[PDB]
From a paper:
Here we identified 2′-phosphouridine (Up) at position 47 of tRNAs from thermophilic archaea. Up47 confers thermal stability and nuclease resistance to tRNAs. In addition, we identified the arkI gene, which encodes an archaeal RNA kinase responsible for Up47 formation. Taken together, our findings show that Up47 is a reversible RNA modification mediated by ArkI and KptA that fine-tunes the structural rigidity of tRNAs under extreme environmental conditions.
To find the structural basis of Up47 formation, we crystallized TkArkI and determined its atomic structure at a resolution of 1.8 Å using X-ray crystallography. As observed for ePKs, TkArkI also consisted of two lobes, termed the N-terminal and C-terminal lobes, which were connected by a hinge (positions 96–109). ePKs consist of 12 conserved subdomains that fold into the catalytic core. TkArkI had subdomains I–V in the N-terminal lobe and subdomains VIab, VII, IX and XI in the C-terminal lobe, but lacked subdomains VIII and X. The HRD triplet in the catalytic loop (VIb) of ePKs was replaced with HGQ in TkArkI. In addition, the DFG triplet in the metal-binding loop (VII) of ePKs was replaced with DFE in TkArkI. Although we demonstrated that TkArkI is an ATP-dependent RNA kinase involved in the formation of Up47, we observed a clear electron density for guanosine in the cleft of the two lobes, which corresponds to the ATP-binding site of ePKs surrounded by the hinge and metal-binding, catalytic and P-loops. However, in the guanosine-bound TkArkI structure, the P-loop was dislocated from the ligand-binding site. In homology modelling to ePKs, ATP virtually bound to the active form of the ligand-binding site of TkArkI. It is likely that the P-loop and other motifs form the active pocket for ATP binding following tRNA binding to TkArkI. The electrostatic surface potential showed a large positive area on one side of the TkArkI structure. Instead of the missing subdomain VIII involved in recognition of substrate peptide in ePKs (mouse PRKACA), the basic surface in the C-terminal lobe might bind substrate tRNA through electrostatic interaction.
Numbering used by the authors: 1 to 216
C-alpha cells in the first residue's frame, strides 16, 4: 500500500528521515485511516505505531482523535503513547505496538474475556464511545487486551461493553462461534448473558456478567 495520492514522494522521504532522527527506524506503511496515515517502526529495539494526520483530512478531526487516544492511554485502555511530534505542519503520535492478534483472529481465553470486560467497562466509565468494536479489528488480544484506533470515537453515551459482549456471545459470527465451541456455551448461558447485559445497561452493574464469566 502506498499513500501517493495524499503526500508527495518528497514529503514521505522527509517524514521517514524525521522519524529516523527521533530514533524510529525500519518504518513501513500499515494503513490509511479517515484521519491519518499509519506506519509501523522500531524505536529502542521495540515495535511502535506512528499515526500522521492525513493532509487531505481536517486537522480538527485528528486533534479530536488524539485527545481521546491520550485519555485512553492514560487509563490503560489503549497502548501507551510514547511521543508526539509535528512534521511539515502535520501532527503525529507514536505509541507502543501491542503484540498479539485482533480478536477477529485471536484465540480467546477466559482471562481475556475478563480483561475485555474490564477495558470496555473502563472506557464506558470515561464516557468515551470507541465506535468500531464490531468487526473485531480494533481489540488486540495479547499480553494485555487493548482497544486501538479512535478515529470514530467521541464523548457520548458509550456502548463499548455491550457491543463487545454482543459480538462475542450473542451475535452469530466467526468470533462467537469459536468462543461458543471452546467454552461449551449453551442456550441457558446465552439467556443469562442477555440478562447480565440488560442489568449492566440499566444499573451499570457488572455483578451478573462477572458471575457468569467466572463459571467459564
Ligand atoms: N497486534 C497489533 N496489531 C495492530 C496494532 N495497531 C494496529 N494493528 C493492526 O492494524 C489493524 C487496524 O489498525 C488491526 O486490526 C491490526 O491488524 C497493535 O498495536 N497491535
Amino acid at each position: 500500500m502506498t499513500f501517493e495520492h495524499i503526500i508527495s514522494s518528497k514529503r514521505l522521504e522527509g517524514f521517514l528521515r524525521h522519524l529516523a532522527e527521533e530514533g524510529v527506524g525500519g518504518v513501513e506503511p500499515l494503513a490509511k485511516g479517515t484521519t491519518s496515515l499509519v506506519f509501523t517502526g522500531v524505536l529502542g529495539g521495540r515495535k511502535v505505531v506512528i499515526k500522521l494526520q492525513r493532509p487531505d483530512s481536517p486537522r480538527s478531526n485528528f486533534e479530536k482523535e488524539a485527545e481521546l487516544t491520550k485519555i485512553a492511554s492514560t487509563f490503560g485502555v489503549t497502548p501507551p503513547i510514547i511521543g508526539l511530534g509535528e512534521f511539515e505542519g502535520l501532527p503525529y503520535l507514536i505509541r507502543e505496538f501491542a503484540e498479539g492478534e485482533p480478536i477477529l483472529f485471536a484465540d480467546v481465553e477466559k482471562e481475556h474475556l475478563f480483561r475485555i470486560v474490564e477495558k470496555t467497562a473502563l472506557l464506558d466509565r470515561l464516557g468515551i464511545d470507541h465506535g468500531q468494536i464490531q468487526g473485531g479489528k480494533h481489540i488486540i488480544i495479547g499480553e494485555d487486551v487493548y482497544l486501538i484506533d479512535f478515529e470514530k470515537a467521541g464523548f457520548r453515551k458509550p456502548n463499548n461493553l455491550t457491543s463487545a459482549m454482543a459480538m462475542i456471545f450473542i451475535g452469530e459470527n466467526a468470533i462467537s462461534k469459536r468462543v461458543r465451541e471452546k467454552f461449551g456455551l449453551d442456550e441457558k448461558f446465552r439467556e443469562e448473558m442477555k440478562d447480565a447485559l440488560r442489568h449492566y445497561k440499566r444499573t451499570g452493574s457488572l455483578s451478573r456478567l462477572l458471575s457468569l464469566l467466572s463459571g467459564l
